[PDB]
Amino acid sequence: MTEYKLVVVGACGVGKSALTIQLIQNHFVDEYDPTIEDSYRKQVVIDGETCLLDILDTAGQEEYSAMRDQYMRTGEGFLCVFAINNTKSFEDIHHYREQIKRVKDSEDVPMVLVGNKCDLPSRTVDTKQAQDLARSYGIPFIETSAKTRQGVDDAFYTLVREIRKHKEK
Numbered sequence: 599m600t601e602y603k604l605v606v607v608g609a610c611g612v613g614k615s616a617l618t619i620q621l622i623q624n625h626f627v628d629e630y631d632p633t634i635e636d637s638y639r640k641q642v643v644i645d646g647e648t649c650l651l652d653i654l655d656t657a658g659q660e661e662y663s664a665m666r667d668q669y670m671r672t673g674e675g676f677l678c679v680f681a682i683n684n685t686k687s688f689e690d691i692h693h694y695r696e697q698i699k700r701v702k703d704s705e706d707v708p709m710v711l712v713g714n715k716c717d718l719p720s721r722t723v724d725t726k727q728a729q730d731l732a733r734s735y736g737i738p739f740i741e742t743s744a745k746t747r748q749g750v751d752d753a754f755y756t757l758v759r760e761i762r763k764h765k766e767k
């Protein structure tokens with residue numbers, strides 16, 4: 599069965615683990631160790647194709663930098679997550695975009711921009727600002743809430759569809 603290797607990146611505290619756990623286990627966790635990096639496997643059906651998602655929930659620094667390069671080189675698509683109430687997390691997207699492109703040595707890497715925590719009233723990054731960034735990158739942008747589940751399937755399924763478009767060239 600086809601497997602898609604997905605990697606979730608972004609600043610600490612944006613909701614990478616909460617998003618992953620909602621996708622895999624269908625519930626919201628308010629408390630999940632910010633230092634835990636692990637992979638989850640989930641069989642799903644996307645556009646009629648039964649496939650396996652192999653998702654790496656990243657946690658930032660690695661014991662050795664070679665471990666970061668290894669997962670960036672082997673990952674097929676990347677969910678770049680910021681939180682709509684954390685401007686620093688949005689500014690950090692530039693760093694994640696540039697770093698993945700450098701490790702893969704490619705200008706065409708399947709990526710989706712995710713603005714998480716859209717259930718919160720507090721917002722410091724308006725939608726337009728993120729739409730403009732995603733346009734400059736040529737990638738989709740999805741607002742999500744790991745708490746309410748809004749957009750969660752869409753974010754991950756859209757990344758799979760971006761990977762498919764890349765593979766068919």
Ligand SMILES: Nc1nc2c(ncn2[C@@H]2O[C@H](COP(=O)(O)OP(=O)(O)O)[C@@H](O)[C@H]2O)c(=O)[nH]1
Pocket residue numbers: 608609610611612613614615616617627628629630631632714715716717718742743744745746
């Ligand atoms: N209200 C709200 N809180 C969230 C959401 N996603 C994550 N959180 C909270 O933000 C904190 C950090 O989330 P976490 O998944 O650990 O982020 P990570 O460091 O990127 O893995 C946790 O306390 C979660 O309760 C969301 O969509 N809405």
Ligand SMILES: [Mg+2]
Pocket residue numbers: 614615616630631632633634655656657
């Ligand atoms: Mg985490």
